[PDB]
Amino acid sequence: QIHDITGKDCQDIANKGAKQSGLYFIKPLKANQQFLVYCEIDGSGNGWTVFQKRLDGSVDFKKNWIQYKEGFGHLSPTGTTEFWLGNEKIHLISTQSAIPYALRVELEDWNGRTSTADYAMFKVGPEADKYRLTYAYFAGGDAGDAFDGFDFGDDPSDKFFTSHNGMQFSTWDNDNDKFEGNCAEQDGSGWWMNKCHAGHLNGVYYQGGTYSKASTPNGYDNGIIWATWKTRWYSMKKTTMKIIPFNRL
């Protein structure tokens, strides 16, 4: 169920001997209390700390500010459950000791195809700054750089409106996006919204992947999308968001 070795993150845990993916307790520099996390440990001593997992539609991601801050969903020793670790926890881990962390987004098709996109020096700011997302540069991966924005063809400024670097976090009850409307409320989720998104992993779980403007009453493209890999009308089967010290790349 829960393992004995502890550390500041899952890589520290892997450095002390652990070799099994599962549940562990970690306690980041500024964390006043230790908390449970799911570590993904491979055969090379890499220990990834997982903060988001989607895989079957068992959890509703339309949650409020406090819920996204504190975390929701279920942690499993087998890693077969959906959850959002919580913004406060993501902030403590990603910023401890100025350690440079890499973010890996892992996506899976309804056809079995898996792809990734890595971001170097990933950080999530404090609540005072609405848990802002920042990264140095896109490090590569076959899923493409959706965080850089995308020209959907709706408006000439599409790319400027869909990039995510520097965006604050938004929920339906705490709008901090760059839109006249409320992106989080119209989509029904919590995310680093601009106006509104090119990459959005906290969307509605559409069975089968393919969906359309007809699926929803207003025709919003509110699924689990990553524009640089699949069409905005294609919703992912599984997603994983995880972090590890940059030197482990």
| CA pair distance 102, 43, nearest whole angstrom | 19
Nearer to Ca ion, 179 or 246 (CB): 179
Is 177 annotated in some ligand binding site? yes
- How many residues bind Ca ion (CB under 5 A)? The answer is 3
User: Which residues on adjacent β-strands are paired with residue 225?
Assistant: 200
Is 147 annotated in some ligand binding site? no
Please select the residue that binds Ca ion; options are 108, 158, 175, 185, rule is CB under 5 A: 175
CB of 176 to Ca ion, least distance (A): 8
CB of 216 to Ca ion, least distance (A): 20
CB of 133 to Ca ion, least distance (A): 17
| CA pair distance 46, 247, nearest whole angstrom | 10
Is 181 annotated in some ligand binding site? yes
Query: How would you classify the pairing of strands 133-134 and 101-108?
Result: unpaired
Is 148 annotated in some ligand binding site? no
Number of Cα atoms under 13 Å in the Cβ half of residue 50 = 26
Torsional sign, CA 151, 154, 157, 158: negative
Residue 138 binds Ca ion (CB under 5 A): no
Nearer to Ca ion, 148 or 175 (CB): 175
| CA pair distance 77, 66, nearest whole angstrom | 25
CB of 179 to Ca ion, least distance (A): 4
Cis status of the peptide bond prior to 196, with omega within 30 of 0: yes
Site residues for Ca ion per CB under 5 A: 175, 177, 179
Q: Which residues fall in the annotated binding site for Ca(2+)?
A: 175, 177, 179, 181
> From the annotation, which residues make up the binding site?
175, 177, 179, 181
